[PDB]
UniProtKB/Swiss-Prot annotation, chain B:
ZnF region ranges: C4-type: 6-31
Gene Ontology biological process: maintenance of transcriptional fidelity during transcription elongation by RNA polymerase II; transcription by RNA polymerase II; transcription initiation at RNA polymerase II promoter; transcription-coupled nucleotide-excision repair
Zn-finger segments (TFIIS-type): 71-113
Natural source organism: Sus scrofa (Pig)
Family: Belongs to the archaeal RpoM/eukaryotic RPA12/RPB9/RPC11 RNA polymerase family.
PANTHER family: DNA-DIRECTED RNA POLYMERASE, DNA-DIRECTED RNA POLYMERASE II SUBUNIT RPB9
Top-level lineage group: Eukaryota
UniProt-annotated location(s): Nucleus, Nucleolus
Primary location class: nucleus
Protein name from the UniProt record: DNA-directed RNA polymerase II subunit RPB9
Length: 48, 114
């Protein structure tokens, strides 16, 4: 049956939406800002 | 807190108590050279090891290329709104992530830690 219907994989199975890419970049930027914030707290010796 | 050496044979000095006058008497037992010590301290050991690292840092570390370079937090003796920040990174001497600021002026070198 797979001989008829066929299975594959390609580039189109990896591309996400532009809104998705914007959301992922926003999440990465927020994570980087948060780790910058916590390392700044660790720099000035307030991290208990 | 501090040690010194013998005079006429130039050897290392060992302690001795005095039987008569009850004063500590540093002396070289390769000699008969006896003298008193004004410090009145023989042995100190900071086991928790809170030494002052401000004398540990070389005043010339600021002119390193690959160290960071901040723009805020100016120096004290001179204004010079440019400084270098780093950590001690000394093993077994505490675990603090607190920063060691050095002024980067060529003739300055007043270092502070906030
Ligand atoms: Zn001697
Ligand atoms: Zn300075």
């Amino acid at each position: 049956w797979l001989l008829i219907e066929g299975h594959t994989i390609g580039i189109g199975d990896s591309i996400a939406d532009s809104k998705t890419y914007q959301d992922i970049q926003n999440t990465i930027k927020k994570a980087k800002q948060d780790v910058i914030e916590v390392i700044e707290k660790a720099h000035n010796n307030e991290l208990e | 807190v501090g040690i010194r050496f013998c005079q006429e044979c130039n050897n290392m000095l060992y302690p001795k108590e005095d039987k008569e006058n009850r004063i500590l008497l540093y002396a070289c037992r390769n000699c008969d050279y006896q003298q008193e010590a004004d410090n009145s301290c023989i042995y100190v050991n900071k086991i928790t090891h809170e030494v002052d690292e401000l004398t540990q840092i070389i005043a010339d570390v600021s002119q390193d290329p690959t160290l960071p370079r901040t723009e805020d937090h100016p120096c004290q003796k001179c204004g010079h709104k440019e400084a270098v920040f780093f950590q001690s990174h000394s093993a077994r001497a505490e675990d603090a992530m607190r920063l060691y600021y050095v002024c980067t002026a060529p003739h300055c070198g007043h270092r502070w830690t906030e």
